[PDB]
RNA sequence: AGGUUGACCUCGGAUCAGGUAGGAGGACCCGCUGAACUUAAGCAUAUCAAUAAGCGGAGGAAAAGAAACCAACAGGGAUUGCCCUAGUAACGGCGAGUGAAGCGGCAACAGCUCAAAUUUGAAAGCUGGCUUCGGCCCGCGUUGUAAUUUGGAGAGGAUGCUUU
RNA sequence: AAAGCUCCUUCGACGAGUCGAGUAGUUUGGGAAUGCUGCUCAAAAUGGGAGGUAAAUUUCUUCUAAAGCUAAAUACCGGCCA
C-alpha cells in the first residue's frame, strides 16, 4: 500500500519537499475561504486512520483559524476587581484551535455530524485544519453498521460537547495518577467529592 | 475539622430511598432471575489473592477466567461466555498454583454443566442428553462456588516429634541479617570490583 | 526466574512459589522493526533527505566537536536520550557514506 | 522525453561563503555537505547495481506485506 | 428522525459468524 | 456486461458440473489501483509500470520512480490520468501497471519495455536529480535583459 | 473538421429530485467563560471558588468506559456509584484554612470496531430512478467500496474431527 | 460454502506538528510542572509512556498513546402519572 510512504514521508515535515508543497498548499489556502470544502483530503492517509471513506455521505471541510492566546473581552483592558484576576494579556484559552474550528465548521453544516478533524498547515496567523464530517440522513451512512452509531441523537454536536478527540484531550480523560481530577468529569468529580451524604442510621 | 465554609446546604445527600431502592434491585434481581431461568443470575468467577502484603493473605473472586486457564480446562474462549464463564484477557498466571486451582474449578464447573440443545430435535454430541436433563439445579454460582478458604487455617496440630530444629542463629539474627545484606549489596559489590580492579592492575 | 527466599526482608524476598515462563504476549512486540518498515523507511529517508538541524549535526560531527554536537542535539529534540540517539544515527549516516565510498 | 523550460539557476539553494550558522535557513543553505550527500546517491546506485527483457529485474529481494497463500 | 428496525438491527459480517456458530446457549449447573 | 456474460456462462457450467476453471480461461489485463501497483512493484511481479504526472496531492506518487527503480522496475511518466482511466474504464487512474501479457504480445511488450528503456530513462536519469521552477516573469527577465546589456555596453 | 472533436480537474447556477438544521425546555448531564460580598487585626498570596451570573450542546439519563491502568504483591484487571481509605498523604503569609489516590467489602457487570495487507482468476461493495418486482439503467468508487485482520492476536503451513 | 479447536520453520504491518522538551498563563493535595492551553523546538523503533525529589549510568516491572462504539448499577427544585 502507498499509505505508509505517505506516513513516513508526512513524518518527515522539515524536508525540502514537504516544506515546498506546505509553502504552495498554505498559500493557496489562504487565498481561498477561511472555511471552504475541499473535494478530497489532501492528506488521505491521515484522513483514512482518522475514519475517512470515500462512501457518499463523508465531507472534507477545510478551515483556518487565527492563533495565539486569549485577550480578555474587557471594555479597556480594566477587570474590575482583585489584581489577581486583573491580568488582560498572556492569556490561554482552554480549548484547542483544533476544537475551535472544529465547532465553527459544524455550525456551518448543522445536518451533519463532525466525525474527526486533523492539521494540514499553518503560518505566523492561521493554523489550518481539515475537518471530517459524516452525513447522518444519507442510506448508506444509515445502512453501514460501522458508521450508523453516529445517526443517534446522544450524538449530536459531538464537537460542541467534547466528544472528539481534541475534546477528550482537553477533558483529560485518561486513566492513571496523574488524571485523578479530571478522569470521569472534573466538575462531576468535585460535586461528587464536595457532596454531604447523611444516612438514615448515622 | 468541620468543612462548612463553602455552600453546602445545596449538595446535601440524604438517603431516604434506602428501603425503595432495595425494593428496585430486588425487583429487578428477580426479573433478571426469571429472564435467565434456568440458567444462574450470575457468571463463573476464578480465585485470585488479593494484592499487596496487607491483603495477599486472603484469597477473592477475580473479573474472569485467563485463556491459558481456558486452553488447559478444554473450554474455547468464544463458548465460555455463551456458557456463562467470565473470560479475563488481561490477567496472567505468574505460578503454577492459582492456575492449578482455576483449572481445578473450571473442570468443577464443566462436569456439573448441563447443556440444552440449540434445537432439541437434532441433540448435537456436546448438547446434554433429556435422559439426565433433569437434575436439582442451583441458581447461585456465587453461593455455589464460592471462596470456601479465604484464608489459610490459623490452628494445625502436629506431633511432638516433627518440631522444626529452627533457622540457625535465631529467628531474629536472620532478619537483621537480611536488612543488613539488602541494605549492603551495592557497598560490597563495589569493593569485590575494587579488588578485583587492584589484582589486574597488580597483575 | 529466581526462587524466592521465603523471608519478608531482604534480597528475594517473597512467598515461594513455583515461578512459570509465559509465552511473550504480542502486545510487548512494539518497538520491533519489521522488514517492509525498514524498507519503506530508508526509501523516504532516500526521497526527503535531511532535516537543518540534522545537517547542522553532521557539520558538527564531522568537524569533531561530539559534546557539541550531542548538546544541539539536546537543545534541538529537548532529552538527553533523544539526542544520543540522534547522534549515533547520524554517526551511522556518516560512517556508510564514507566507508562504502 | 517532454521537457519545460528551466530556470539559470538549478541545483539547490546554497550560499556557502556566508559564515553565519544561527537560524534554519542558514543550516539549508550555508552547510555545504555535498560530498556526503554524493556520497549516499552512489551508494544508493550501486546497490541498485522476449521473455528475459520481461523478467529482467533487481538484485534486492521482494518485499512482501504477509505471507499470501 | 430515528433509524429503521432494519438498520439499527443491520450487523457486520463477522459478527453474523460469530453469532450463527456461538449463539447464547440455555444451560443449567447441577447443585 | 462482459463480467455479466461470463457469471452466466460459469453459472450454467457448474450447473451440469463441470468447473468454472473449465470454461473460463486465465485472464490478462491492465493492473490498476495505486495500492495494487504498489504491492506489485514490491512483489517484483510488474513488467511494466505507467504514472500519471497530474495527480493531486502528488504524495501519492512522488515515491513511484524511487521504488520502481529500488526494484528495478520499467516505470514511465506519462501525461493524463483521464488517458489511464480511459484505459481502466474509470475517470481517473493514477498509476498502472502490466505485469503478464498473452503470448502473441510478448515482443510487443518487449520492445515497449526497451524503447522505454533507452527513451525515456536514459534521458531522465540526468534530469531527475535536478531542480526545477525558477523561472522570471515577463517583465521582470525584461528588465534584467535590459540592467544586463546595460552593464555589458558600460 | 484538427482554428476541430472530446476526456478529466476545480469552481458555479436552478422555486431541479429527495432530505436535514434552527426554536422551546434546561431539575439532573457535557464543556467554555468567570466574579465579588465573605473568612484571615486590615490585606495585594490564600479563602469564598475552579462557585454565582453569562454562552454553546444532548438524553431518559447524560458522561465515563474495555489500560500507553494500579501496583511492587503469593500480584490485581473496562467504566460508574455506595461504605471505608481519610479529615489521612499532601498543599498553604505551613495562618485562616484546603485536601485526594492505591488496596478492601458491596451494587451492577458485556464486550468490541477501524487505519496500517494485492480479491487481483475477474469492485465481489453502495446511493438514486423506472419497474412487469424478474431485474434494468444513471451514477459513487481503483487518490479504494465488500470479504479478511486488531495485539487477547493474527497471516501462512500442517492436521483430523466438530460447527451451522 | 463459511466456523472452531490442536501444533509450527517463518512472517507478524500497530495512528506525527503527535509524543516529548523549554517558556508563559491557569489549575491541582500534586510539592526542583498534577492537568489543560498558547508560542518555540521537535522525535524514535524492543521503540515509547509510567513507576509522586531534579540529573548521568546500568537494570527491572507494567501497559501500548496521539482513531472509534457500547447496556446496567448513578443523578434528577423540569415534564406526566400515582
Known amino acids: 500500500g502507498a499509505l505508509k510512504y505517505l506516513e513516513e514521508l508526512s513524518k518527515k515535515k522539515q524536508s525540502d519537499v514537504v516544506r515546498f508543497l506546505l509553502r504552495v498548499r498554505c498559500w493557496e489556502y489562504r487565498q481561498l475561504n477561511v472555511i471552504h470544502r475541499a473535494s478530497r483530503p489532501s492528506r488521505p492517509d491521515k484522513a483514512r486512520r482518522l475514519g475517512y471513506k470515500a462512501k457518499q455521505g463523508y465531507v472534507i471541510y477545510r478551515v483556518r483559524v487565527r492563533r495565539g492566546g486569549r485577550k480578555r473581552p474587557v471594555p479597556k483592558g480594566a477587570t474590575y476587581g482583585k489584581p489577581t484576576n486583573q491580568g488582560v494579556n498572556q492569556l490561554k484559552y482552554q480549548r484547542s484551535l483544533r476544537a475551535t474550528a472544529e465547532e465553527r465548521v459544524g455550525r456551518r453544516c448543522s445536518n451533519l455530524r463532525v466525525l474527526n478533524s486533523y492539521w494540514v498547515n499553518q503560518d505566523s496567523t492561521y493554523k489550518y485544519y481539515e475537518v471530517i464530517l459524516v452525513d447522518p440522513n444519507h442510506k448508506a451512512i444509515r445502512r453501514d453498521p460501522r458508521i450508523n452509531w453516529i445517526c443517534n ?17 482537553s477533558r483529560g480523560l485518561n486513566k492513571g495518577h496523574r488524571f485523578n481530577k479530571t478522569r470521569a468529569g472534573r466538575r462531576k468529580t468535585w460535586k461528587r467529592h464536595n457532596t454531604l451524604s447523611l444516612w438514615r442510621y448515622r | 475539622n468541620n468543612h462548612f465554609r463553602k455552600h453546602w446546604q445545596r449538595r446535601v445527600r440524604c438517603h431516604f430511598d434506602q428501603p425503595g431502592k432495595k425494593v428496585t434491585r430486588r425487583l429487578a434481581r428477580r426479573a433478571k432471575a426469571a429472564a435467565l431461568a434456568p440458567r444462574p443470575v450470575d457468571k463463573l468467577r476464578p480465585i485470585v489473592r488479593c494484592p499487596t502484603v496487607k491483603y495477599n493473605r486472603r484469597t477473592r473472586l477475580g473479573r474472569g477466567f485467563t485463556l491459558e486457564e481456558l486452553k488447559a480446562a478444554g473450554i474455547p474462549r468464544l463458548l465460555a461466555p455463551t456458557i456463562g464463564i467470565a473470560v479475563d484477557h488481561r490477567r496472567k498466571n505468574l505460578s503454577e498454583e492459582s492456575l492449578a486451582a482455576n483449572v481445578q474449578r473450571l473442570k468443577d464447573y464443566k462436569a456439573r454443566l448441563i447443556l440444552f440443545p440449540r434445537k432439541s430435535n437434532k441433540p448435537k454430541k456436546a ?77 | 526466574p529466581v526462587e524466592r527466599t521465603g523471608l519478608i526482608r531482604g534480597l528475594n524476598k517473597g512467598h515461594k512459589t513455583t515461578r512459570r515462563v509465559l509465552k511473550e504476549r504480542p502486545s510487548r512486540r512494539k518497538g520491533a522493526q519489521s522488514k517492509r518498515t525498514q524498507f519503506v523507511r530508508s526509501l523516504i529517508r532516500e526521497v526527503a533527505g535531511l532535516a537543518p538541524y540534522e545537517r547542522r549535526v553532521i557539520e558538527l560531527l564531522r568537524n569533531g566537536k561530539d559534546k557539541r554536537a550531542r548538546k544541539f542535539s539536546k537543545k534541538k529534540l529537548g532529552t538527553f536520550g533523544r539526542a544520543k540517539r540522534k547522534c549515533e544515527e547520524l554517526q551511522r549516516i556518516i560512517a556508510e557514506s564514507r566507508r562504502a565510498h | 522525453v517532454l521537457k519545460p523550460l528551466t530556470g539559470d539557476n538549478t541545483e539547490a539553494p546554497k550560499q556557502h561563503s556566508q559564515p553565519s550558522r544561527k537560524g534554519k535557513k542558514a543550516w539549508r543553505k550555508n552547510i555545504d555537505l555535498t560530498e556526503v550527500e554524493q556520497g549516499l546517491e552512489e551508494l544508493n546506485e550501486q546497490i541498485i547495481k522476449a521473455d528475459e527483457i520481461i523478467a529482467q529485474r533487481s538484485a534486492l529481494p521482494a518485499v512482501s506485506v504477509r505471507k499470501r497463500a | 428522525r430515528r433509524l429503521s428496525k432494519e438498520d439499527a438491527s443491520r450487523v457486520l459480517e463477522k459478527t453474523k459468524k460469530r453469532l450463527t456458530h456461538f449463539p447464547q446457549r440455555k444451560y443449567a449447573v447441577k447443585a | 456486461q462482459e463480467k455479466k456474460e461470463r457469471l452466466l456462462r460459469e453459472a450454467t457450467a457448474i450447473k451440469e458440473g463441470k468447473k468454472k476453471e473449465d470454461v473460463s480461461k486465465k485472464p490478462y489485463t491492465v493492473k490498476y489501483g495505486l495500492n495494487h501497483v504498489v504491492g506489485l512493484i514490491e512483489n517484483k511481479k510488474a513488467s511494466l509500470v505507467l504514472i500519471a ?21 520499467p516505470y514511465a511518466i506519462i501525461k493524463g490520468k483521464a488517458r489511464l482511466g480511459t484505459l481502466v474504464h474509470k475517470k481517473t487512474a493514477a498509476v498502472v501497471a502490466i505485469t503478464e501479457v498473452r503470448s502473441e504480445d510478448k515482443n510487443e511488450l518487449a520492445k515497449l519495455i526497451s524503447a522505454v528503456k533507452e527513451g525515456y530513462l536514459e534521458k531522465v536519469e540526468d534530469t531527475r536529480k535536478r531542480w526545477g521552477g525558477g523561472i522570471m516573469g515577463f517583465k521582470a527577465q525584461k528588465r534584467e535583459e535590459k540592467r544586463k546589456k546595460s552593464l555589458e555596453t558600460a
Open chain 2, 127 to 203: 448438547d446434554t442428553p433429556k435422559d439426565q436433563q433433569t437434575a436439582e439445579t442451583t441458581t447461585s454460582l456465587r453461593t455455589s462456588f464460592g471462596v470456601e478458604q479465604p484464608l489459610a487455617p490459623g490452628f494445625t496440630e502436629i506431633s511432638k516429634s516433627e518440631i522444626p530444629a529452627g533457622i540457625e542463629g535465631g529467628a531474629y539474627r536472620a532478619l537483621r541479617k537480611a536488612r543488613s545484606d539488602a541494605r549492603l549489596v551495592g557497598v560490597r559489590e563495589k569493593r569485590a570490583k575494587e579488588k578485583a580492579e587492584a589484582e589486574a592492575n597488580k597483575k
Open chain 6, 53 to 73: 504526472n497530474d495527480v493531486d496531492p502528488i504524495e501519492l506518487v512522488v515515491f513511484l520512480p524511487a521504488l520502481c527503480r529500488k526494484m528495478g522496475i
Open chain 1, 153 to 169: 441523537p446522544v450524538h449530536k454536536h459531538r464537537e460542541c460537547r467534547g466528544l472528539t478527540s481534541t475534546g477528550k484531550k
